[PDB]
Design a protein around this nucleic acid. Sequence first.
RNA 1: AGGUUCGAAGACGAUCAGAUACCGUCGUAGUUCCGACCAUAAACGAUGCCGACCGGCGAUGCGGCGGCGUUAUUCCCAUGACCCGCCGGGCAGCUUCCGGGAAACCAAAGUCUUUGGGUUCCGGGGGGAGUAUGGUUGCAAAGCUGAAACUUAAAGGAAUUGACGG
Lengths: 71, 129, 24, 102, 135, 221, 220, 83, 83
Amino acid sequence: GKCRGLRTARKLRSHRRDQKWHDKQYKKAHLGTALKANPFGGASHAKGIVLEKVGVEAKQPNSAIRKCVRV
Amino acid sequence: VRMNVLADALKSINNAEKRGKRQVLIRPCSKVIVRFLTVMMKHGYIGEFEIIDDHRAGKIVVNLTGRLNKCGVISPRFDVQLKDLEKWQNNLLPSRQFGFIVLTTSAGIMDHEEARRKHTGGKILGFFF
Amino acid sequence: MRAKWRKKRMRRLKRKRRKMRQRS
Amino acid sequence: TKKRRNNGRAKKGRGHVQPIRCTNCARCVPKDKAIKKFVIRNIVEAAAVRDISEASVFDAYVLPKLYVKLHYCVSCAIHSKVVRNRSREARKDRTPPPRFRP
Amino acid sequence: MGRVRTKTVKKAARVIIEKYYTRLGNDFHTNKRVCEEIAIIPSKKLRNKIAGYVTHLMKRIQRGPVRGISIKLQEEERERRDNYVPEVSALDQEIIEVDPDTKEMLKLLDFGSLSNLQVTQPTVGMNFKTPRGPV
Amino acid sequence: GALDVLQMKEEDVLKFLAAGTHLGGTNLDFQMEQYIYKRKSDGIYIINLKRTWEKLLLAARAIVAIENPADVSVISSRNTGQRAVLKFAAATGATPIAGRFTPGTFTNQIQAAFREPRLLVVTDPRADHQPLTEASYVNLPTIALCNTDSPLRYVDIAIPCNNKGAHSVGLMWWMLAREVLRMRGTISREHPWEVMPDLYFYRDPEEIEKEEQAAAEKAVT
Amino acid sequence: EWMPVTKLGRLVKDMKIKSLEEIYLFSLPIKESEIIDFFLGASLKDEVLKIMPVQKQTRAGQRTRFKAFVAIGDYNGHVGLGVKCSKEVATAIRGAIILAKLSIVPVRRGYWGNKIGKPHTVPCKVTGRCGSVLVRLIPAPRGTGIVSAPVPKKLLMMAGIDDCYTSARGCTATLGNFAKATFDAISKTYSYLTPDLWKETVFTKSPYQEFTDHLVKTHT
Amino acid sequence: MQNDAGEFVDLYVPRKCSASNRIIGAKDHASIQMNVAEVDKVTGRFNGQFKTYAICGAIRRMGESDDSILRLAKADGIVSKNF
Amino acid sequence: PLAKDLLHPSPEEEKRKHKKKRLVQSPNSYFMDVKCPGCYKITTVFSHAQTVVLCVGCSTVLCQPTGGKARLTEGCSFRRKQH
RNA sequence: AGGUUCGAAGACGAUCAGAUACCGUCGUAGUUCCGACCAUAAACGAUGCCGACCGGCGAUGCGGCGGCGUUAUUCCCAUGACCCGCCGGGCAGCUUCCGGGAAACCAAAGUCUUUGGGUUCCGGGGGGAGUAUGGUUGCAAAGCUGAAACUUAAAGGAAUUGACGG
Ligand SMILES: [Mg+2]
Ligand SMILES: [Mg+2]
Ligand SMILES: [Mg+2]
Ligand SMILES: [Mg+2]
Ligand SMILES: [Mg+2]
Ligand SMILES: [Zn+2]
């Protein structure tokens, strides 16, 4: 079970903030490596220069050439 | 080891009530237990209870009237102020028409209605409905 | 694979990696 | 799913039980897990008892018995049909099969 | 092989036996001659098969109480059940062999000291219960 | 029955001891322990005949509390008691069920065998667990003739007498019939009942098939 | 054109029992659906919650049967839920209607506080359980309505409950379990004991003994 | 029930088991309500009036129904004290 | 049995119960007067004595300690102290 | 130190389409003992410890207590071996609509939306991955601590029907 003493608040909060690192949303939002790996750098939109026009094959059940641009 | 005598007694009463026994024996007695049982008896949820007195901590035999649903305990005796007594009340009670919360106050061990009547807070003890 | 044999394969690969790094 | 409450063996309050070798394939089986058969067979065939009695130099000669304790892993037990698979309800009984005296 | 009768013939045979037990007999031809007027059988083969089963069941009935209802068998059973109360009861024994413990029970009940009770010597050894396990 | 008229008589004691009905089994049910006097050196439990009488009188009151005598049903699956339940039903106007009890009798309302009584009288709980279980679907109170090892799961007026002895079963059924008839306006409580308790006794076929011819020889000679 | 085979059904038919509460008092099982329409005629509103196509794999492919969940009840304190699986959807619907009629329970309405007029909410917080679905009904003040998922919302509405908080846990996507748990929670409102019911119960005659003389004459 | 105005706002009042004091539910078909017929003092004949005991399904499924009925009959006077 | 009287248990079960699990704790041991043959004085001996009790007027042993109760030497008499 | 047997590696004979295997013959290290390391197992009850309560039954092990009797010697009790019980602590078993649970099942995995006896460890979809790197321990093998990028819409558990089974 969990501790329930009147002066267990330190252990409760320490365990909570230790266990909060084990879900993906908190880890992504508070580690910063996801922010570094994000090409937009935490921005909603971005601007770029079209390097090329490419076609991407769809997944296994579908069959199409999705039109994309390398930017 | 046994660290909450009141919790053990209340769990024993609840289990005997669920099983349908007519009498329950709670082995470690205390003043807190006697006051809690007196509150429950004055509100009519239990019958008479008799204290077997040995030179150690006594025992109590309670006559169960069959009109008890739950008599749980709040083991960490939180400080209850009159401003948060309502939140405790609607967290622990089945409804606002019945059910009582026993809390130990400076004026004594008594239910939340009397605590609000004489305008005092205290430490939470348990509840019964 | 069997998990035990994946473990063995990984151990072999780790020894090879340690040897390569120690060589440097 | 847990198939058997006793986990297919008699080990209840023990940590380790010494192994034995299967009489058929020499597999190491825990002693409490192996199927044990205590065969007590006439040392001569029931067809040849009369011939041995006739050829005996004695009159009231009691033919000796042969006492062998056999241990089986469950694989050899099932292959040799000493034990058989049973239904989910029928697995729970432990009464040995009847001797069929008559 | 392959002479098992079906419900169509068995039920019909039982019904006509319980209806016309007086007219039926142990002769197959006599039974197959009563069948045409005691029942409507669409087929001659069905009729004679039913008649054969009727002969079999009547042989079984005359040798014993087959489950098929029969008024003579039922009145005999009635006489054998609701009568033959013996002229002397089976519960009016002159003496009753009574255990001392039961005698104490009767004494506590206040029915002790009865002239029709003879106290047995209690057994010694306490050797009840079957030996546990095999062997 | 707490009254002086509602007391066991010496004749009743004599019949009870002659038929047995106090020699229980070697096993004891924890809910049947309260009816036991003492355990013999035989391992046989002795049942308090006074408690048995009180439970029998309570069962008689429960039976006579029903206005329609057909609303009470009597069941004995075992052969040692089918004659008893038939004679009990004949005497008291009850509805008998003997031998095989088809499941769904009290619950499946389609077949013509469907019936719904107001009281369930059972010869033996172990032998008649099926009507006992079916009684819990239709709000059916139950009297059962229980032994020292008889389960009391769905039993309400358990009578602690016997269920193994044919003589005991016949005697207890005859006693219950006599009690309900005397509670009703049938027998005047004074003279002994004219029905011999042997009329309720189950007889084995090797007695049915020889006693009548023995009596025939004794009559012709 | 209704010919009952039941003592209770006969008594209902021949104007011997006046209220469904008389049956509810003695907990007599309702074994035929033509009993309760005689009482709640033209007031039993009906609704179909879901049609689900269960399947059973066989040698020649899998066959499909349709399961119907049907909730009925007048908006005054009676509600019932019936589940019936049948080959045809219409047959399943009719069977589910019959089963919902059979399984009609009364609903106890209480007050959140300051009892003024007609009761509007559950008398206390009640928990229904079915599978992994746990449904808790909490009393609510006047005018809040039913706050809940739609599937328990319609059931609580046709049960006559005006205001109620709901809290559900588990796989509530399982509509059958999620409706059955709420039905259990509604049904145990009387099973819950409250101090206003502490009075010692006076016992009245059961219908079976009250009309035993008429039953002998009519229901042979 | 029994709002401030005083009237009983409740369509029916369920029975309570005479042993465990538990509410007998509407769909609890295991429950029973039997009648025990008491007799007159002098002749032991049924006098018409009786007394009723109700037992809930939980009690008469756990098996304490016989003990419950016996205790109630003892308390009410049906069973003699020297039982 | 839902209605066992816990307040007033009869002495039979009161004695069969464990010493600590009784309603009030009661030791199973006692004190006894012991008479050694050939001696006049009376020795007070614990029933569960752990030591070899000896007479001061005679070089004789009165009891031998065992697992549960001191086994008195043969020829010695004994009586209880006040039940 | 010792090395009988068995037997990783290895050799050979078979089998096979191939057969670095399953089968057979031989056989090194090991398996044995003493001393020093390692600290891992489906190290399992896949189930933390302490405490209380909540059904029944028959057994079993130890200790104690009380009883008809049988048995051992002896002249009687003790003391052993049985028989019948009671108590306490254990290994368990059968049964049950106590109750729980997704169910299998569990008298604990119960006394949980009627949620609080005390306390420790620990999980957060599947992979990547128990991987990389850093630290630390070790003679080594390795042990402990332990990511991220990226990828994915399921992966899983229990049960039901069918199909299939050398
Ligand atoms: Mg498997
Ligand atoms: Mg191990
Ligand atoms: Mg070799
Ligand atoms: Mg803790
Ligand atoms: Mg993960
Ligand atoms: Zn083998």
